[PDB]
Amino acid sequence: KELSFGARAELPRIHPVASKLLRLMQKKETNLCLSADVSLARELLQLADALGPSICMLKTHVDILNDFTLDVMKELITLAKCHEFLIFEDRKFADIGNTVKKQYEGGIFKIASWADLVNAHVVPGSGVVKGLQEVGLPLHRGCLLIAEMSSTGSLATGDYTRAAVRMAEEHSEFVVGFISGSRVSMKPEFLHLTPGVQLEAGGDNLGQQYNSPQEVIGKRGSDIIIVGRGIISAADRLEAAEMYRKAAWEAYLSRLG
Amino acid sequence: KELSFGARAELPRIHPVASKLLRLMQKKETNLCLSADVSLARELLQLADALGPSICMLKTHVDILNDFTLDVMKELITLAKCHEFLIFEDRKFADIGNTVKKQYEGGIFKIASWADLVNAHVVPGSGVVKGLQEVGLPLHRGCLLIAEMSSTGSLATGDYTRAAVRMAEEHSEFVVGFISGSRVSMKPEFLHLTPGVQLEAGGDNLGQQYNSPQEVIGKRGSDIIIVGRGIISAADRLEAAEMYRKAAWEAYLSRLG
Ligand SMILES: O=c1[nH]c(=O)c2[nH+]cn([C@@H]3O[C@H](COP(=O)(O)O)[C@@H](O)[C@H]3O)c2[nH]1
Ligand SMILES: O=c1[nH]c(=O)c2[nH+]cn([C@@H]3O[C@H](COP(=O)(O)O)[C@@H](O)[C@H]3O)c2[nH]1
């Protein structure tokens, strides 16, 4: 039987990052993650500020920020704290453990220094998790494993997906959940986040397919919707965010009973 | 009867980037790609200068450079042209097409502006290739697809690998070859680059495993060895590079017969 976000936050095996997330979701009645896919620091921060009350999480691609500095991230963390949301860097770590450790801690981005959550592809095998965890465990960070993809011709199906779940379950000290299209694990300590979400049917010219918040949360058993263009491209980003929040939240409430 | 690199450079369906690469490999008697896994620009540039004559390609992880600027890349391009090697940014693009085009063209790194070659995981479906090529084709760049990985528990096996090969064949205007452990394509227009290479047997504690140049080039039929710590960790990186070059080159010569 399904526990609320609030109750899942208190589970014995729950990761502290997952717990923080689950509490603010329950408190704010939001299971929406904004995908802030913009190329300017100014717009990133304006959206984070205006939409922060509507969201549980702000997902970034800092490698697309034309004017990235660590100070932009400082400002982002202030908004995260003020409005209460987690920052998820959608880096999709996908190298060998020795390499991803450096990409996570170092370079220009210093992702580990500001990102509550990052994600990884599982294709390299568990060394990818092991490398990230050397940096992320001391910094009290969490990781999401890419179990399925939204895009057309995704190879993250069947046994690949089962491998992702196995890897998460065996690295629960650092791995807090999945990027997936549906519920992939039966353990309620794990989060499921689902991109490829819009209110209306369709896709884009480059392989992306869409499903509705009611489908993903209500029918497919996911926890959080990740929404980019469905919000960012809208004229009124605030009413768009509210629309997605209310959709995903009501879908969750009806699944719960 | 196997074609030399020089003959392959003239193949009717050869990609211009592959052709340029194959011709300098022939000219300089090198099928060594230096994996320049360093965090300081000065060491990067000193290695590229000293080892440039011994290598056909210099592979970078720009996201690990503590003092990255576009000017560092300018200086690297100069050395690349002076010594005749290609620059390969090992970015492992792995998002949906819409995102990867932004990550390739834009952000701080502007990878497409200086990288002859980049690579991609095939997990997202062919959208990842379609995305990169929107940027890459107009800039006369090439892409390598990751068909296999060297690390323990790699899921790039069986149908996953066969999928990578199909995806390359179907996007030959942009895809010039593979990262793999062995020959995966019968078509000689495609390059095979193989990481996880050292003169001695062994591995690291984050899932990396090693095979020799002789095994990789001679027995498994790959074209180019990618060598990081085998060279970088040596006192004399120039003599180390020469050892790897001679090993890989002679293995290639003995395969041709
Ligand atoms: O880890 C992932 N697995 C997926 O299946 C997937 N599909 C889309 N994306 C990323 O999510 C965002 C989607 O943005 P749109 O709502 O604008 O399509 C963008 O930021 C994309 O990069 C994915 N990430
Ligand atoms: O695309 C890839 N598929 C692979 O299977 C693989 N194995 C290692 N690497 C990368 O290659 C370099 C190898 O470094 P070492 O020689 O120091 O182990 C390092 O830069 C690693 O990031 C891989 N890249």
UniProtKB/Swiss-Prot annotation, chains A, B:
Listed transmembrane segments: none
Positions contributing to UMP binding: 35, 37, 59-61, 95, 99, 150, 208-210, 228-229
Coiled-coil region list: none
Keyword Ribosomal protein among record annotations: no
Acetylation in keyword set: yes
Cellular component annotations (GO), alphabetically ordered: cytoplasm; cytosol; nucleus
Keywords per UniProt: Acetylation, Decarboxylase, Disease variant, Glycosyltransferase, Lyase, Multifunctional enzyme, Phosphoprotein, Pyrimidine biosynthesis, Transferase
Any GO BP annotation: 'de novo' pyrimidine nucleobase biosynthetic process
Active-site residues (renumbered): 90, 92, 95
Metabolic or biological pathway: Pyrimidine metabolism; UMP biosynthesis via de novo pathway; UMP from orotate: step 1/2; Pyrimidine metabolism; UMP biosynthesis via de novo pathway; UMP from orotate: step 2/2
Positions that bind orotidine 5'-phosphate: 35, 59, 92, 95, 99, 150, 208-210, 228-229
Annotated disulfide bonds: none
Top-level taxon of origin: Eukaryota
Any one GO molecular function term: orotate phosphoribosyltransferase activity
Listed EC numbers: 2.4.2.10, 4.1.1.23
Renumbered residue ranges of the record's region OMPdecase: 1-257
Catalytic reactions on record: orotidine 5'-phosphate + diphosphate = orotate + 5-phospho-alpha-D-ribose 1-diphosphate; orotidine 5'-phosphate + H(+) = UMP + CO2
Family: In the N-terminal section; belongs to the purine/pyrimidine phosphoribosyltransferase family.
Disorder this protein is connected to according to its UniProt record: Orotic aciduria 1: A disorder of pyrimidine metabolism resulting in megaloblastic anemia and orotic acid crystalluria that is frequently associated with some degree of physical and intellectual disability. A minority of cases have additional features, particularly congenital malformations and immune deficiencies.
Assembly description: Homodimer; dimerization is required for enzymatic activity.
Known function: Bifunctional enzyme catalyzing the last two steps of de novo pyrimidine biosynthesis, orotate phosphoribosyltransferase (OPRT), which converts orotate to orotidine-5'-monophosphate (OMP), and orotidine-5'-monophosphate decarboxylase (ODC), the terminal enzymatic reaction that decarboxylates OMP to uridine monophosphate (UMP).
Full protein name: Uridine 5'-monophosphate synthase
Organism per entry: Homo sapiens (Human)
Protein encoded by which gene: UMPS
